[PDB]
């Protein structure tokens, strides 16, 4: 199975320390007016794991819903998940153990947009986002992950649902695997994640802000 | 080349929160009186990367000097090191870039003894030790890593030097590779390291306590 990922890429109610990370409602919405962005791991062109299935400018931020498809990547995650003491401990009641989702939840807890200043380039899964509020929520059902975020209106969800339900090209009768990296890369990426100062308070901050306190796989 | 690792496994001047982690001078020294301990990664029997070359009860703690030998492990570290943004940034002047040492320095910053309550079982490299003062200092020269710790006396160093200079069995004319794990395991281990609450202040604490503020590869 593929894994779906939801979260904000930017937030309108959050003001970044680094002013370059500003991304207001006027700018985001005009950009969405101006064929589907790649999903990579720590902005590595060789670590594309899928695509952004939906994008929606909602009350509080730019929300997106990416799709992790790569068999090569998900197979790395599978083998690595069976060697984590965190994953072994399990998820909160009443969720079923899902080693693959739990590992991604732990390892790639953040979202990071790559944008100008076409205006959006791609989205990266990463340990923590530099913009606050950018918690990554993984799960098998996209309707389910989108429901993790309680402040999304039914108006917002409909706009999102429209995008991830939209059928791709009927032409090619296979699903390509974009992933051109390895577990060595993902291991290389891991050290860096350890040296982001106070990662876990940043993640805790993101969690309560976006109200992901509602059963989730989030490890923070 | 192999890589040497120095650090305390316990400290006499540090009192653990968990009383089970007590390990006093009487007990440590009597245990050293009662064929060389394996060095593994996060206490995984399949992740032996070498051996403890020396052990010395000094003024402040149980100090040890392990040796990371595995070609299979060091080759994983090599490939992963070329994919770290931390490793790319380099070490402090005036040290030469050493991607392998830098990665281990970042990734496995802690030491963890496995002991009773024969009394010592093995030593694990890990992200952070649960006992404080247990900073891992890596480097190519064992005389050099031992010199990172300024509070070790020349009496202490001589006792250590004796042990790592002592010739092994002249019988077998090869050096075996104990490592029976993979990069998937090391990747699996990495998530857990992310969820140790305030890892970096613990590491900073260890660093100044043992006076590793003297050019080092330590990333904390």
């Amino acid at each position: 199975t593929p894994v779906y990922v939801g979260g904000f890429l930017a937030r309108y109610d959050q003001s970044p320390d680094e002013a370059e990370l500003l991304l207001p409602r006027d700018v985001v919405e005009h950009w969405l007016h101006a064929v589907a962005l790649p999903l990579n791991i720590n902005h590595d062109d060789t670590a594309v794991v899928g695509h952004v299935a939906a994008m929606q400018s909602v009350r509080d931020g730019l929300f997106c819903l990416g799709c992790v498809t790569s068999p090569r990547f998900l197979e790395i995650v599978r083998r690595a998940s069976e060697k984590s003491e965190l994953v072994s401990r399990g998820p909160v009641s009443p969720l079923q153990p899902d080693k693959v989702v739990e590992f991604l939840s732990g390892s790639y807890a953040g979202l990071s947009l790559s944008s100008r200043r076409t205006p959006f380039k791609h989205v990266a899964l990463c340990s923590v986002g530099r913009r606050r509020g950018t918690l990554a929520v993984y799960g098998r059902d996209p309707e389910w992950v989108t429901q993790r975020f309680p402040d999304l209106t039914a108006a917002d969800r409909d706009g999102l649902r429209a995008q991830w339900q939209r059928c791709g090209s009927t032409a090619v009768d296979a699903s390509g695997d974009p992933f051109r990296s390895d577990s060595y890369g993902l291991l290389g990426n891991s050290v860096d994640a350890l040296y982001i100062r106070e990662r876990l308070p940043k993640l805790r901050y993101d969690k309560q802000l976006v109200g992901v306190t509602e059963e989730s796989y989030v490890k923070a | 080349t192999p890589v040497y690792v120095g650090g305390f496994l316990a400290r006499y001047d540090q009192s653990p929160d968990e009383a089970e982690l007590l390990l006093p001078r009487d007990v440590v020294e009597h245990w050293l009186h009662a064929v060389a301990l394996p060095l593994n990664i996060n206490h995984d029997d399949t992740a032996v990367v070498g051996h403890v070359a020396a052990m010395q009860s000094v003024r402040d703690g149980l100090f040890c000097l392990g040796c990371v030998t595995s070609p299979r492990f060091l080759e994983i570290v090599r490939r992963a090191s070329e994919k770290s943004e931390l490793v790319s940034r380099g070490p402090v002047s005036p040290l030469q870039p050493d991607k392998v040492v830098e990665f281990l320095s970042g990734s496995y910053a802690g030491l963890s003894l496995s002991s009773r309550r024969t009394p010592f079982k093995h030593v694990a490299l890990c992200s952070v030790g649960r006992r404080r003062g247990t900073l891992a200092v890596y480097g190519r020269d064992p005389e050099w890593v031992t010199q990172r710790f300024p509070d070790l006396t020349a009496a202490d160093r001589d006792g250590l030097r004796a042990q790592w200079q002592r010739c092994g069995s002249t019988a077998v004319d090869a050096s075996g590779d104990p490592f029976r794990s993979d990069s998937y395991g090391l990747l699996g281990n990495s998530v857990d390291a992310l969820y140790i609450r305030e890892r970096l202040p613990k590491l900073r604490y260890d660093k100044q306590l043992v006076g590793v503020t003297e050019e080092s590869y330590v990333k904390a």
Binding site: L9, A10, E20, L21, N42, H43, L111, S112, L113, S114, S115, R116, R117, K121, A124, C126, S127, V128, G129, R130, R131, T134, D192, I196 | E85, L86
Partner: peptide, 13 residues
Amino acid sequence: FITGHYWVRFLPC
């Protein structure tokens, strides 16, 4: 490009 990342901050365009 500007990213919302800690390590890969800018990106060629």
